Enzyme design. Structure first.
Site, PDB file in Angstrom:
ATOM      1  N   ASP A  98      54.210   4.215 -59.684  1.00 24.53           N
ATOM      2  CA  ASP A  98      54.262   4.265 -61.145  1.00 24.53           C
ATOM      3  C   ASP A  98      55.589   4.894 -61.560  1.00 24.53           C
ATOM      4  O   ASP A  98      55.831   6.071 -61.291  1.00 24.53           O
ATOM      5  CB  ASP A  98      53.080   5.055 -61.724  1.00 24.53           C
ATOM      6  CG  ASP A  98      52.863   4.784 -63.208  1.00 24.53           C
ATOM      7  OD1 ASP A  98      53.855   4.595 -63.941  1.00 24.53           O
ATOM      8  OD2 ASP A  98      51.694   4.756 -63.647  1.00 24.53           O
ATOM      9  N   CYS A 135      35.309  -4.254 -66.558  1.00 26.55           N
ATOM     10  CA  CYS A 135      34.250  -3.266 -66.523  1.00 26.55           C
ATOM     11  C   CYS A 135      32.954  -3.872 -67.051  1.00 26.55           C
ATOM     12  O   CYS A 135      31.869  -3.850 -66.461  1.00 26.55           O
ATOM     13  CB  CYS A 135      34.508  -1.985 -67.339  1.00 26.55           C
ATOM     14  SG  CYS A 135      35.717  -2.261 -68.676  1.00 26.55           S
ATOM     15  N   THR A 136      33.100  -4.466 -68.228  1.00 25.42           N
ATOM     16  CA  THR A 136      31.979  -5.025 -68.966  1.00 25.42           C
ATOM     17  C   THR A 136      31.314  -6.190 -68.234  1.00 25.42           C
ATOM     18  O   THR A 136      30.089  -6.283 -68.199  1.00 25.42           O
ATOM     19  CB  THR A 136      32.431  -5.489 -70.354  1.00 25.42           C
ATOM     20  OG1 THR A 136      33.039  -4.390 -71.044  1.00 25.42           O
ATOM     21  CG2 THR A 136      31.248  -5.995 -71.158  1.00 25.42           C
ATOM     22  N   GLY A 168      36.484 -11.133 -73.378  1.00 24.27           N
ATOM     23  CA  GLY A 168      36.315 -12.372 -72.647  1.00 24.27           C
ATOM     24  C   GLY A 168      35.555 -12.071 -71.377  1.00 24.27           C
ATOM     25  O   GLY A 168      35.895 -12.557 -70.301  1.00 24.27           O
ATOM     26  N   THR A 206      39.571   2.844 -75.250  1.00 26.52           N
ATOM     27  CA  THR A 206      40.423   2.802 -74.066  1.00 26.52           C
ATOM     28  C   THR A 206      41.870   3.125 -74.415  1.00 26.52           C
ATOM     29  O   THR A 206      42.222   3.229 -75.590  1.00 26.52           O
ATOM     30  CB  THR A 206      40.379   1.424 -73.385  1.00 26.52           C
ATOM     31  OG1 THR A 206      40.619   0.402 -74.360  1.00 26.52           O
ATOM     32  CG2 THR A 206      39.031   1.192 -72.727  1.00 26.52           C
ATOM     33  N   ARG A 244      44.989   4.758 -66.170  1.00 28.31           N
ATOM     34  CA  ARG A 244      43.669   5.358 -66.290  1.00 28.31           C
ATOM     35  C   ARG A 244      42.757   4.822 -65.203  1.00 28.31           C
ATOM     36  O   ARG A 244      42.029   5.565 -64.548  1.00 28.31           O
ATOM     37  CB  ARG A 244      43.068   5.074 -67.665  1.00 28.31           C
ATOM     38  CG  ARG A 244      41.812   5.865 -67.965  1.00 28.31           C
ATOM     39  CD  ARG A 244      42.142   7.289 -68.374  1.00 28.31           C
ATOM     40  NE  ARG A 244      40.960   8.142 -68.383  1.00 28.31           N
ATOM     41  CZ  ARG A 244      40.769   9.157 -67.546  1.00 28.31           C
ATOM     42  NH1 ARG A 244      41.691   9.450 -66.640  1.00 28.31           N
ATOM     43  NH2 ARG A 244      39.663   9.885 -67.624  1.00 28.31           N
ATOM     44  N   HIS A 290      31.268  -0.178 -76.799  1.00 33.52           N
ATOM     45  CA  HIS A 290      32.213   0.261 -75.786  1.00 33.52           C
ATOM     46  C   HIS A 290      32.981   1.496 -76.236  1.00 33.52           C
ATOM     47  O   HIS A 290      33.329   1.629 -77.407  1.00 33.52           O
ATOM     48  CB  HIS A 290      33.178  -0.883 -75.459  1.00 33.52           C
ATOM     49  CG  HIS A 290      34.003  -0.656 -74.230  1.00 33.52           C
ATOM     50  ND1 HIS A 290      35.013   0.279 -74.174  1.00 33.52           N
ATOM     51  CD2 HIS A 290      33.976  -1.256 -73.017  1.00 33.52           C
ATOM     52  CE1 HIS A 290      35.567   0.253 -72.974  1.00 33.52           C
ATOM     53  NE2 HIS A 290      34.957  -0.670 -72.254  1.00 33.52           N
TER      54      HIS A 290
END
Lengths: 338, 338, 338, 338
Positions: free
Chosen positions: D35, D153-154, D213, D183, D13, D180
């Site tokens: 991939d 991201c966070t 984390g 995902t 993704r 959030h």
């Protein structure tokens, strides 16, 4: 003997589920329902069917113009005006103002005049009507008051949790966030909302930063914590159940394990029923139907130190609150008619 | 010579997008908008921010009291009475009726009265106004018609497919189901819908069976298939884009390979931009913002035998339909202002 | 006069809900479970809490390395090779294959290898194993068949209806569609789906067209309908419950009300518990935890003429099917121990 | 002169939107993708079609077993073993490890092995590898660093905001919650998740407490706030865009206006492109496609007092991160080459 006779004005979400809670707890007896925007035959449907709480676990039909529910006849009304409902003839003492449009003592007095119904209970935070939370100041109810308030459902979650921490570690100051399920007041697609623009955006596709005075109104429920609490809301794509995210500063230095012990002690003792305690890996569907006002999620809580922690507690914003409405009546009846 | 000057009443979902569709094709001119509930301030917001189609590609602002959109100024009104909307002043010769209230010719004529709206364009099915589906009964439109209708979004998807299949294999009889995204008419949670009880349920946790006036209306656009078509709908938890599921018997033999190449020749052919052909692995999101009225899905269509098949055609119920509102005016202004 | 001794392989969403059905019906005794990804502790969690069907109605715990439900003890194993599961020591006489890895007869003989399990029921439709549907061909089970499937859940819905409609009015031909909920085989966000690209898309964002032979598989349980039936599937953002959409040409003509009368009788006849009949304003969430295989909605389904009708029937794709799995086994126990 | 030549391992993704952001910004050149589960044909469909971000803006085809995008060629590989990928033949200097399987300096060196790749970037946070947040500590990159991380991201949301705050008013202590989107690691329905039970639950039915984390990780990016800040996450039913809810104690007294100005100044200054400032009444879906790491929401943030405030910042948890990966690469190719 001598159970409280109850009536309902406003058969919305937070008005039909209150009716469910009544036949469950069996602490009061519903005798009357009024809603001009809902037909009588429709009423049976909305009771029997519910996309969140399933079908009613009893017997619902119609006896001769009266809604028979689990073997109990209830008269139905449909007056546009709230002062046009004859509660007396139904024998109702306490009216539940769940329309959420008459939230003032002046407007709600429309139920009380012409000697009809004695006390009026608003299922929303009121500006003039004294608000109550069954966990904290349910006992502050004086008999000379007619139009009360059961505060908001976020308030019914935070206030009982606030009491424990404050009474045991002293909350210096705190900020709250509620991840709230969407409510009837929202739109399925980007629709009109000339006041709260965000609240008009499509409910399923959006995280909507709403607002709430529920945390700010905890001061009215708990005066020792007045002006030491406030917070906002996030409305997220879930049909029901909400969680409170409290972050505050305690006076006494306490580790998280200490906090846990106090809460576990409260949810078992004096708050057995209002406050609940679990250490399981729960999510917001394990609570659909929970009668509790707050379920402390011990696991998801985090402590940065001994004077600054983040606490989390769930609540069924629809059904937990509904039950606390039923409780406030029992208390009053216990207090006015004893 | 000129482009048609257009006005819009009812800044709803299927109305704000019609506007968004005008600055894209740039085939006509939006000059005025009317909605009492949504102020100018709000109008900018509703236009600029969209949960489905994204932020408006351009600079939407205000100027001197009126709305401006990429160097074009749009007069704004808030009249609840269509008769009192001043289209004559604004310069609006063409009006789009997207409120849902006005459907009758004598009803939609409150826009026409007294030296303003030339032709009235109802963006919804009308049981008296001559409904027309661009690409089908497009040229069938007459200059002697004061009020026309574009019928439903769904019927704008089936008819261009129906025509093709009919005009080559002759559709004997057929039943249609449309899996439809939810619309503003529904409730986020179980709510009041006295007429259509099922559309009162929580739209986001339910597959809600409906019934649409889209299928027999194809008989109104394609007389040859009058009374040979009918079918109901299913509303599902998606914010936009819907799909037609057409099951029908044929008069002539057909290999599904033929029907494919028949549609492909009709998609790239005369119906270019109206009907589209695809073989790809498409899902609903692959059609958000699509301008086609009907996108035939090759692999998703099933066929029992040489005479009895099941076709599948996608469509953006919001944006695809809003385009055919725009195209119709280019046709009218061609015919109706010249 | 005895009870079936049942073991489960594959502790997914069919595996668990089959277990719930066993204690709800109390006609069989689950004695063992196996899932190399799910340990004893986790199983408890997955049995206790369930997002779709709420918390488990009864007693679940652990004891002496064995799962304990309502007083019955259940051995737990984590074998990834089904031939390594000690079904003999566990006393399991019937094994539910729900891993999907073994659908063929010979890949199912693992549980039977070297005197172990007596029978194996495949919750997934099989390619060689004899597929059956409870209410259509239960009594076609011979005592010698070691491997046997229970069709799909889509299959178990349309099959009972067909043995009514075609059995009375005869559908010369017919096509089918199922607006299905999403299943664990899908993705939360766009992800990998090598062979079936459409299935690897945002399940909450999309209407996904998917092929299914579950309508072609009707010919296996009703030979008379071999090649007369086939259909497809749409998957929508709902967690459970689906609807069948049958568009069939009936030989013996009938009005939309005559056919309703037929299905009525079937609901109160021999299929009392298989095929259900309702006339309520129902939506998908009304049939959560439903035990029926197929609930006909008279209000939903419509008729074009007397020979060309469309029917709509609901089904809990998760729980309803699980109920039939149980019913099949207890039926098998009848024959083997006759 | 020379532009950064980039390869991507794991076309999941996040690795798929990096490619997207690359061609959008054109500041680097993607030359190789790998991939094992996705072949060339599938790889194209995953680019052309996105449920969240829509279709890719460019011509994407296949020239001779090689992926062609906007005229640029990309060779593909299905190597399960990253040390078998000929990054040298492809000419990939900077490789993006977008599979979570190789997140240590030892495990990431397989790309650099045998003289091919010369730098590797971990799309996830790493234990030993030095992490970086562009705009906060991208200048701490040393020519010697062979393997790096871009955190999460966070983290990339909370950090640019925290920097501004801690630099202007100093954050004494702080706690964070991020509402959030779900995902690819979550399940559509209650499924197996042995290590993290709550994440096994249906992603679209529940609010799910999780742990990130990403708040202590700010400490690794800004040591000044290491141990002084931490937090957790609530997972909600949305496909993309998350929000950070930061509660903190300011060393300096700051009013809200005084805070609003603090961020507005940095969003135009040196954090332009990274941190954004807004005052509009926005919702999550307004940020789909945002190339910002953090978007400060004034109207949603509140202040209990001048020293205890609650701040809110939006971020596209999918595409805002992918844009920063491209910036991390562009920065290195600068520093790397001098």
């Amino acid at each position: 003997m001598s159970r409280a006779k109850v009536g309902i004005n406003g058969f919305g979400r937070i008005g039909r589920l209150v009716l469910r809670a009544a036949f469950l707890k069996n602490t009061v007896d519903v005798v009357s329902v009024n809603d001009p925007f809902i037909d009588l035959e429709y009423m049976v449907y909305m009771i029997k069917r519910d996309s969140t709480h399933g079908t009613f676990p009893g017997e619902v039909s119609t006896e001769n113009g009266k809604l028979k529910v689990n073997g109990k006849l209830i008269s139905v009304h449909c007056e546009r005006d709230p002062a046009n409902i004859p509660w007396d003839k139904d024998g109702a003492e306490y009216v539940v103002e769940s329309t959420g449009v008459f939230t003032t003592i002046d407007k709600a007095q429309a139920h009380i005049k012409n000697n009809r119904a004695k006390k009026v209970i608003i299922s929303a935070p009121s500006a003039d009507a004294p608000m109550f939370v069954v966990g904290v100041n349910e006992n502050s109810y004086e008999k000379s008051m007619s139009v009360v308030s059961n505060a908001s459902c976020t308030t019914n979650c935070l206030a009982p949790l606030a009491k424990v921490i404050h009474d045991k570690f002293e909350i210096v100051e705190g900020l709250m966030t509620t991840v709230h399920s969407f409510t009837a007041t929202q739109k399925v697609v980007d629709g009109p909302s000339s006041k709260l623009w965000r609240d008009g955006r499509g409910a399923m596709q959006n995280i909507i930063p709403a607002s709430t005075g529920a945390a700010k109104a905890v001061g009215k429920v708990i005066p020792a914590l007045n002006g030491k609490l406030t917070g906002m809301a996030f409305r997220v794509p879930t049909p029901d159940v909400s969680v409170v995210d409290l972050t505050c500063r305690l006076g006494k230095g306490a580790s998280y394990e200490e906090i846990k012990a106090a809460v576990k002690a409260a949810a078992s003792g004096p708050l057995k029923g209002i406050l609940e305690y679990t250490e399981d890996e729960v999510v917001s569907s394990d609570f659909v139907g929970s009668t509790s006002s707050s379920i402390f999620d011990a696991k998801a809580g985090i402590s940065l130190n001994n004077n600054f922690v983040k606490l989390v507690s769930w609540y069924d914003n629809e059904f937990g609150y509904s039950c606390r409405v039923v409780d406030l009546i029992t208390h009053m009846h216990k207090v006015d008619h004893a």
